[PDB]
């Protein structure tokens with residue numbers, strides 16, 4: 001799994017190859033590789049490890065695989081919730097906010113952005 | 120790989136093991152094992168094959184892996200959108216509406232309900 005770390009405190013992005021599987025947190029992978037993601041708590045409530053994750057691999061919008069044509073057919077019958085109509089219509093590849101200490105790294109490739117501030 | 124077909128037209132649900140792979144459709148396994156899911160069109164815009172799918176396997180809310188604790192941290196910093204909270208906070212295992220001729224079978228197990236009327 002390839003992870004690209006990015007942050008205003010790093011003049012260069014860091015490309016990291018992380019072995020999928022063996023028990024690892026996105027924050028753990030970062031600190032092995034010298035990416036300073038703020039880490040102030042052991043209980044996972046401080047929020048300082050907040051990262052903005054873009055999924056480079058896999059599904060564009062995770063867990064929603066419908067074609068544009070299947071989604072419009074279900075709208076002529078009223079069969080798509082309104083909340084899933086808005087999600088699928090995003091033009092930009094949507095980012096997900098996570099806490100790195102709570103995020104377990106899998107085979108997928110990721111772009112991981114963080115401000116660098118302990119906040 | 121295991122799909123449970125259910126419908127008011129059958130007093131018994133039908134348990135089917137269908138081999139996975141990306142070239143097979145949910146409606147194909149249905150007729151092939153004899154459920155009679157209404158199949159009225161070749162181009163997939165009629166909507167008659169509409170099914171209600173509950174995912175028995177895998178992630179509870181597809182594409183949302185946050186623990187309840189991680190969602191509380193992100194919502195407290197305003198980093199969790201209200202429409203992604205709504206998805207994760209559901210009490211009941213949420214159903215997904217799909218067109219059976221547009222749904223491609225994977226290894227994950229499914230319960231698939233359909234009304235039985237050709238619509």
Ligand code: FES
Nearest residue numbers: 041046047049101
């Ligand atoms: S380090 Fe405190 S929440 Fe991740």
Ligand code: FES
Nearest residue numbers: 160165166168220
């Ligand atoms: S048969 Fe018309 S949508 Fe599947």
